[PDB]
Amino acid sequence: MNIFEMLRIDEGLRLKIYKDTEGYYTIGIGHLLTKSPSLNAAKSELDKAIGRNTNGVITKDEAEKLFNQDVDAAVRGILRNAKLKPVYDSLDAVRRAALINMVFQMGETGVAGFTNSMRMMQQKRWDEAAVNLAKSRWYNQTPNRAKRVITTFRTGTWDAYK
């Protein structure tokens, strides 16, 4: 199991524009298109991204191309973030994939505000960090996905995912 397979499970795969859990236009493998309410704005953002007139539909190939770019952006975003980097560098391979999942779903930004968890993670206080991670909107809104990532941090295994 790896990051791609892991996010591919958490996000699903859709080829038609859709509303995510928050009602934002999304497509592919968790690719947020826009925060706005206009489907037009969504379509326009889609076409700009894909580089053709999609008419709100893409193929698998294109979903997968967005997915690659998004994972890559996430890694590079952690690495460039002063608060995340050190976190990421201290972790083992499984756990980094968990931090990358979070960053993917919520932005470097949303992630860096879990300071307390972050610091616990850096100290290797697994059970405590897991408890802290659970006191968040993130968990209350998407509890099953949050639990998988959380076990992941806690155990440093892929069990949540098998």
- Which residues of the chain form contacts with Cl ion (CB under 5 A)? 49, 142, 144-145
List, in sequence order, every beta strand (DSSP E) within 111-153.
Answer: none
Helices then strands, each counted (H, E), the chain? 9, 3
What CA–CA distance (Å, rounded) separates 21 from 65? 23
Asked whether 156 and 92 are in contact (CB, 8 A), the reply is yes
Is residue 20 annotated as part of the catalytic site, yes or no? yes
Q: How far is CA 120 from the centre of its chain?
A: 21
117 in a labelled binding site:
yes
Closer to Cl ion by CB, 49 or 63: give it.
49
Is residue 127 annotated as part of the catalytic site, yes or no? no
Asked whether 62 and 50 are in contact (CB, 8 A), the reply is yes
Provide, rounded to whole angstroms, the least separation between the CB of residue 124 and Cl ion. Answer: 27
Closer to Cl ion by CB, 105 or 117: give it.
105
Provide, rounded to whole angstroms, the least separation between the CB of residue 70 and Cl ion. Answer: 8
32 in a labelled binding site:
yes
Catalytic residue positions, numbered = 11, 20
Binding site members? 32, 104, 117, 132
Binding site members for substrate? 32, 104, 117, 132
